[PDB]
Structure formats: structure tokens, C-alpha cells
Amino acid sequence: SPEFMSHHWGYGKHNGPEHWHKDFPIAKGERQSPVDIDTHTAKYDPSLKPLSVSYDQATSLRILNNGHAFNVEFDDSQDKAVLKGGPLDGTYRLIQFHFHWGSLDGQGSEHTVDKKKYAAELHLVHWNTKYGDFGKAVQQPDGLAVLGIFLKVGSAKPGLQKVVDVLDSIKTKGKSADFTNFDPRGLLPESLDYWTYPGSLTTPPLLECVTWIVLKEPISVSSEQVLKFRKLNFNGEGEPEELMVDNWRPAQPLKNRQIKASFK
Ligand SMILES: O=C1OC[C@@H]2CNCCN12
Ligand SMILES: [Hg+2]
Ligand SMILES: [Hg+2]
Ligand SMILES: [Zn+2]
């Protein structure tokens, strides 16, 4: 049971975000994520470029319940699924995506917009090819680019359904399954308008390597889709059930950072 045999970071009362600094001191660092996006402080930057999403040749491989979310993993041994343009210099390869979500529809996102919490947030994680591999990229201030997409509850997202339907097979921590031919273009909204700022990954080890690109337009998913997320488990098989919900970190201090908008 959580925190009895040993301690591990998580999202509970004894090991949640407010505790993470005890094992990962960078949790109190100068470029932590997520942040609140104050729409009356972020300035339009006309030097930013349109975001170039080239996911046509993506190769998904597996889906994994890692005890704090599920990752959909991709073959990143070539430039098969890349993010370019905008604030980015060069080419960033997609390695995985995952979500953060709530126990109820009024919370779940990590970023907020004028303090608004969405029901969930999708993170597509990419690494800068100039550093050769993800592990070297996460030793650099421009090593990663994360495309963040808000989810609200409304109409269903057809391109999400294949994800929803596989979750029964990865209910518990450590379970993985084959998950080929998944097209992440089915998770995008219509507009690629975005905000951008320098930050970190939002789970330990909280690495301060990320250029965040947060889309303004949410995607809609149905109540039934997000309910299926909430049937996942943080625990392993044969351990008592602890539902995988509220796996989000709250907003962190902006400090001296600037949030830029791609749109006037
Ligand atoms: O994010 C927002 O929202 C309002 C303002 C418009 N100009 C771009 C930056 N802003
Ligand atoms: Hg974990
Ligand atoms: Hg890989
Ligand atoms: Zn994330």
C-alpha cells in the first residue's frame, strides 16, 4: 500500500507535489512548470513562427502504465515525427505522449489559463536532435519541446478512442501492451495558436530543459472517454486499488519568465 513499505513520489497526501522538493530540490528552481498563463500579460511576438507539426510518418510502438500516467511511446531513431518552427531552433523528435487528468471535470490540467483548470492536459514530448538522444538532451536548457493541449469535456474525440479502449489492458502499474499505428494527429485541435515559455518537465526529476508550446484551443473529449482514464490504477496488480486520478502538478512561480503568444 502507498507509503507503507517505502516512500516514492506520487500524487497523494504524503508524497504529492508539495513533498517532491525533499528528493528533487530543483522542484523549487527558477524555471519550473506548469505555470498559470495570464492572458493579459503574455505578449504577441510577431517574430515567432507557425508551429510545424510533421507527424505523417509517426511510428507508435507500445503503451505503458508507469504508475503515474500512461505513456504512448514512439520510434525516435529517425526524424519520423518532428516538431519544428515557432520558438524552436532546429528539429525536435517525438518520443512519447501522456496525459494528466482529474478526479472530476473541474480540475486535471497542469497549466491554467487565467486560473482556469481544464479537465485534462496532453503532453507530446520531443527532444532536440542536435543532442543525439533524449538522455543527453535532458542535460541542456533547450533539450526538450513539449506540446501541451488542454482537454475539455464535451463531444468525443474520435482519434482518442483507440487509446481509451486499450486502457483496460494496462490497468495497473508496470503493464505495457503493443500499440502500433497510432496517429497523434488525431489529438490536435483545429488551430495551432499557442503560448510559449521556458520551463521544466512536470514530474520528477523535474528537469529544467523544456520549451513549452501550449495550444490555446482545447480539444473536446467525451465524459465517457475521461471516465475511462479514471479507471486506471496507480497500484500494481495484486495490490489494493488506488485510482489513477489527480496526477497533475499545480502551477509554480513564474519568476522572471516571459510567456509569448503566437497570435495577435
Ligand atoms: O494571450 C493573450 O490574450 C490576450 C492577448 C492578445 N495578444 C496576444 C497575447 N494575449
Ligand atoms: Hg511513477
Ligand atoms: Hg524509442
Ligand atoms: Zn506531462
UniProtKB/Swiss-Prot annotation:
Q: Which GO terms describe its cellular component?
A: apical part of cell; cytoplasm; cytosol; extracellular exosome; myelin sheath; plasma membrane
Instruction: Tell me what the record says results from N66A.
Output: Reduced activity
The EC number(s) given in the record are 4.2.1.1, 4.2.1.69
Which catalysed reactions does the entry list for this protein? hydrogencarbonate + H(+) = CO2 + H2O; urea = cyanamide + H2O
Active site located where? H68
Q: What results from changing N66T? A: Reduced activity
Where along this sequence does the record place binding of substrate?
A: T202, T203
- What would changing L201A do, according to UniProt? Reduced CO(2) hydrase activity
The misc remark on file is:
Target of drugs used in treatments against glaucoma disorder and breast cancer.
Protein name (record): Carbonic anhydrase 2
Name of the gene encoding the protein in the UniProt record: CA2
